[PDB]
Amino acid sequence: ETKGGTVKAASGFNATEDAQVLRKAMKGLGTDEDAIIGVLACRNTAQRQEIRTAYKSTIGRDLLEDLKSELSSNFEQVILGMMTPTVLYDVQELRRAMKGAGTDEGCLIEILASRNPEEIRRINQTYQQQYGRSLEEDICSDTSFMFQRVLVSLTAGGRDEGNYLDDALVKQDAQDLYEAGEKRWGTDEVKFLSILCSRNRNHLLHVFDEYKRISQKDIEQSIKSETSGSFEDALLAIVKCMRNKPAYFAERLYKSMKGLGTDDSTLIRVMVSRAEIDMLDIRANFKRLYGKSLYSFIKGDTSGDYRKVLLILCG
């Protein structure tokens, strides 16, 4: 296959025996990590929830608690992320990004620029239920000025939906972005915020093309020269997710691994969250952009059982 996810529903699914295999893998000194991977990375997220249920009822134990106790470090993080329902995983990642003194702005941007409208609503509902604060409120206490405004707009949605295309308004929006940045002293960043957070995807694709026609620059090139900081990063992520969301994630993956070190938090979250959606597309775009396979990047930059499970999520 060449598009869609890498992890699919397993055939012959037997949740009671999967639970047995996982218990045997952990019981006693030592762990059979290959069995844990060979079951869980070959079940989709829905099926992993059925295994959690069957493990409680037939093992009389808590599968997430046992996995947490038995596994450590990056391997634990991937397996626990894989075990978590989609909405709650995003909720937990947003909370972790804001918990305590720091802020993981890159995570906030990645999730809030890339999730679809219904996903965003579910995240808001579950975050508030779980923590007793709204996501918007936590974003406002962790961010300021224009960056706060873009993230709050992304949480509120309200972007025009659907695809109707008014050629005259496309032209005026492109002219207005040109006049708000490149053509003027300073940048009217509210105009950037307004157009990029309010227009529907189809309109914006047409605005980007027109912007290039009238300025000789890609809109990303003008966002980079005209804005800075986390606000710039947020605008770029919105543009990239509009143009080609799999290539946005391919870039996140490349930047998490290229050069010194690995940003494991980002590598893990992207691999877990996109495995069932568009990982095949992400792979194809990664190879197009970087002329190396995603598989070979993971293989070359990680090790151990962590590596083995990421390579299966990659396919």
Q: Give the footprint of Na ion on this chain (CB under 5 A).
A: 98, 103, 142, 181, 184, 187
What is each CA distance from 102 to 99, 105, 106, in whole angstroms? 7, 9, 12
CB 261 to a copy of itself: min, Å: 9
What gap in Å lies between CA 205 and CA 217, rounded to an integer?
Answer: 15
Q: Which is nearer to a copy of itself, 173 or 276 (CB)?
A: 173
Amino acid 173 reads D
User: Could you count the other beta carbons within 10 Å of the beta carbon of residue 261?
Assistant: 9
Cβ of residue 175: shortest distance to a copy of itself, in angstroms? 13
246 contacts which partner out of a copy of itself, Na ion, none, CB within 5 to 8 A by kind? none
Q: Is the Cβ of residue 114 or residue 187 nearer to Na ion in the bound state?
A: 187
Give exposure, 68-78, as e/b (b: 16+ Cβ within 10 Å).
eebbeebbbbb
The nearest distance, CB 252 to Na ion, in angstroms, is 21
Please give the Cα distance from 256 to 262 (Å, whole number).
6
Nearer to a copy of itself, 133 or 213 (CB): 213
Binding partner selected for residue 98 from a copy of itself, Na ion, none, CB under the kind-specific 5 to 8 Å limit: Na ion
Residue 114 near which of Na ion, a copy of itself, none (CB within 5-8 Å, type-dependent) = none
What token pair was written down for 291? 């002329």
Side chain identity, residue 79: I
215 binds, among a copy of itself, Na ion, none (CB under 5 to 8 A by kind): a copy of itself
Q: What angle do CA 64, 107, 259 make, to 5 degrees?
A: 100
Least distance to a copy of itself, CB of residue 178, Å: 8
**C-beta closer to a copy of itself: residue 257 or 311:** 257
Give the nearest distance from C-beta 180 to a copy of itself in angstroms. Answer: 13
In terms of CB distance, is 94 or 268 closer to Na ion? 94
Whether 42 and 6 have beta carbons less than 8 Å apart is answered as: no
Nearer to Na ion, 54 or 98 (CB): 98
Minimum gap (Å) between residue 181 Cβ and Na ion: 5
Residue 287: burial class (beta carbons within 10 Å; 0-12, 13-18, 19+): middle
**Which tokens in the block code for residue 208?**
């980007």
Note the residues at the interface with a copy of itself (CB under 8 A).
Answer: 178, 182-183, 214-217, 258-260
Tokens of residue 146, six digits: 């224009």
